[PDB]
Amino acid sequence: KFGEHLSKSLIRQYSYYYISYDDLKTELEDNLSKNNGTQELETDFLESLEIELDKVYTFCKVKHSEVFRRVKEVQEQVQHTVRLLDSNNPPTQLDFEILEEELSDIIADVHDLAKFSRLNYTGFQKIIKKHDKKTGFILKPVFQVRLDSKPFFKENYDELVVKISQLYDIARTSGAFTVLSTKSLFLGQKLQVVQADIASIDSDAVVHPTNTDFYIGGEVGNTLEKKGGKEFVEAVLELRKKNGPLEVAGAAVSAGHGLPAKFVIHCNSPVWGADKCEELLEKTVKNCLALADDKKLKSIAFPSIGSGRNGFPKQTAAQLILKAISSYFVSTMSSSIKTVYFVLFDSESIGIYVQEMAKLEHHH
């Protein structure tokens, strides 16, 4: 609350370099005790402020050169490591961790330097406020103009913050799906929402919502066909020939020829409105999961089953699919599936899934 009480909440590591508020406060009161409550007294006080200003300005100038030298050194360090990368970029994780630890240490130094400048600026404005109150002479327009232009914290730091972020992004991009949301189930399965082309996902299995005749089309089928081409189609056609018509809620798997995915799990979702459409949608999901577990797959990517041409309201579908997944994992102890990706196309569906997914094991 008081001027000295708020002053004691400073960075104790640099206590000396801070404004001597108590010493400048006593200098006014002791000189006011003597000269019976002048211009000669004003010069002595302004000389004391100049010693304080030079102390604060030099410390801000010294710490400015320290952070700018630390960035210039790590900028040369990142440029050397990037120039050292050739054919294989294998162990970039630890190299980026030490640069991240040094950059985070500089972030803390710039943060402490910003706290030092704002407290000293307030300290100078408060001592001048007390000067204009205890003494008839006015110094408010003198120091508010002199400190607004040429401040303790330079404008050069905002350019340094953008460069710190640019070097951090280099360590992030050179190292490495995007994962928008993760829900970890109690049995350790990771449910993750990814906004990507499902055909591009490195998952062990990708789910292809089809019909009884393994028709390849719609958002998913087209994207898989685009990615996988002839080999992907040839595999589906063979599967159709071998499997015969896919029963409703049925799933069948083909090799992920021409795709990132190792396998394509084709499923025949029920149509919304079918007598047991809800139960069947859950069964569809479980059949997909079962087929993935049958091949001891670690990951499976799902698009929005049922809410395409099959007409399930997105929320209904989401709720059932998530319910089926939850149920499947609590019912199947030998499941090898560690990650379930929900690869979503539109914002609304993303939002629906992010909301529903959060309802799988909820706390206050």
Side-chain angles (χ1 to χ4, degrees), residues 3 6 9 14-15 17-18 20 23 26 30 33 37 42 45 48-50 52 58 60 62 64 66 70-71 74 78 80 87-92 98 102 107-109 111 114 116 120-123 125 131-132 135-137 141 143 145 148-149 151 153 157-158 161-162 164 167-168 171 173 175-176 181-189 191-192 194 196-197 199-200 202-205 207-215 217-219 221-222 225 228-229 233 235 240 243-245 247-258 260-261 263 265-268 270 272-275 277 284-285 287-288 290 292-294 297 299-303 306-308 310-321 324-332 334-337 339-341 345-349 351-358 360-362:
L6 196 85
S9 72
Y14 319 116
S15 68
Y17 300 97
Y18 275 96
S20 301
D23 297 322
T26 52
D30 295 316
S33 300
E42 289 302 309
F45 183 69
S48 297
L49 285 153
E50 200 64 52
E52 289 303 305
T58 53
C60 286
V62 163
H64 184 98
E66 201 156 78
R70 282 226 262 175
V71 173
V74 301
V78 296
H80 203 97
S87 194
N88 59 327
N89 301 344
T92 52
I98 275 294
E102 189 63 27
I107 286 153
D109 273 31
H111 265 224
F116 180 85
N120 275 284
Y121 179 86
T122 309
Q125 293 298 308
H131 171 269
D132 302 352
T135 82
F137 294 89
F143 290 114
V145 162
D148 278 336
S149 52
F153 205 67
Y157 295 95
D158 318 307
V161 166
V162 176
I164 285 158
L167 314 173
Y168 239 117
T173 54
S181 185
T182 302
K183 159 59 68 172
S184 284
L185 301 178
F186 65 106
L187 299 184
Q189 296 85 5
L191 267 41
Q192 298 183 128
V194 181
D197 167 13
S200 79
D202 189 72
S203 177
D204 283 351
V207 175
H208 175 221
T210 185
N211 64 9
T212 186
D213 295 278
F214 294 76
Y215 179 76
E219 302 183 309
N222 290 349
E225 203 175 316
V233 175
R240 183 188 302 162
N243 188 88
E247 188 178 316
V248 172
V253 65
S254 65
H257 298 316
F263 295 97
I265 298 170
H266 309 272
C267 67
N268 182 11
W272 177 235
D275 291 329
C277 62
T284 307
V285 171
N287 281 338
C288 291
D293 271 332
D294 213 322
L297 306 184
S299 63
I300 183 169
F302 284 88
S307 60
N310 287 18
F312 277 80
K314 300 171 176 196
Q315 186 281 342
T316 304
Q319 158 221 81
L320 293 165
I321 293 158
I325 289 164
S326 177
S327 184
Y328 180 88
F329 288 131
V330 307
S331 300
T332 322
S334 60
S335 182
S336 63
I337 303 161
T339 312
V340 180
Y341 296 119
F345 45 120
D346 69 290
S347 317
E348 193 199 1
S349 293
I352 285 162
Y353 277 73
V354 145
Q355 292 169 125
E356 290 301 322
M357 192 181 259
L360 290 194
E361 295 143 57
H362 183 74

